[PDB]
């Protein structure tokens, strides 16, 4: 109901609602790395059966899209994909009701503007860093010109393409946020269960779509 801030001053008024959520989801994601696969194997094991399928799926959705230079960007796909869809699990699923932070309201990392705009800016300047080495070092953002219709363009679109995927996740996290909160604000918990599975639908679907979305930006970035 309030998405603005936690009063965690750092000289320049940073939001802690991003901070603690990012910390906890990041921690669970990095700490599932050795549930049973601290000594991995060719023969798949406990955590291996989780992680390797994701890795192969990432290779599927990336090498087709990214291109010949698949390897320098295999972290880029997996981090954003796993982090975002597990954090959407934590945002639409993990409850924090009976204990409330006196400063702000915390359910999700991507709730606040800063989280998703940071991730989007990250992917887009990663596109530009890709174009740095992989395009003419004179013109990388403003290269193309047809019979002139595109004289200020090919950079005006990529000004807002970061803004594109940021707002893409903005509204979609605010979506499940509102859908979860409003029916509980209406009537006790047992009535919205028909559509809590609907709220879980897009929560589970965001994984592959954001993977192929920013991977499509990266496949554009090969050039």
């Amino acid at each position: 109901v309030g998405q603005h801030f936690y009063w965690q001053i750092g000289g320049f008024q940073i939001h802690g609602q991003v901070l603690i959520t990012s910390w906890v989801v990041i921690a669970i994601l990095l700490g599932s790395a050795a549930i049973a696969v601290r000594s991995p194997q060719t023969i798949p094991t406990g955590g291996q059966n989780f992680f390797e399928y994701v890795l192969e799926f990432i290779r599927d959705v990336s090498k087709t899209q990214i291109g010949e230079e698949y390897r320098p960007w295999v972290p880029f796909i997996g981090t954003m994909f796993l982090f975002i869809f597990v954090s959407n699990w934590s945002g639409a699923l993990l409850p924090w009701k009976i204990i409330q932070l006196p400063h702000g309201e915390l359910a999700a990392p991507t709730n606040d503007i800063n989280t998703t705009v940071a991730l989007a800016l990250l992917t887009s300047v990663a596109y530009f860093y890709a174009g740095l080495t992989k395009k003419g070092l004179g013109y990388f953002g403003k290269y193309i010109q047809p019979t002139p219709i595109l004289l200020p363009i090919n950079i005006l679109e990529d000004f807002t393409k970061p803004l594109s995927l940021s707002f893409r996740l903005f509204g979609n996290i605010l979506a499940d946020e509102l859908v979860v909160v409003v029916l509980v604000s209406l009537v006790p918990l047992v009535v919205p269960i028909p559509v809590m599975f609907l709220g879980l639908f897009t929560s589970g679907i965001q994984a592959l779509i954001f993977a192929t979305l920013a991977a499509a930006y990266i496949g554009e970035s090969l050039e």
Binding site: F12, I14, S22, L55, A118, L122
Partner: peptide
Amino acid sequence: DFNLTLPIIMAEFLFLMFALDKIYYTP
């Protein structure tokens, strides 16, 4: 509210990206 909270969190997420990339993706 943009001012610099987004890159302040983005830097730590970048460090996560690279270190997690090592400790998981390389093995």
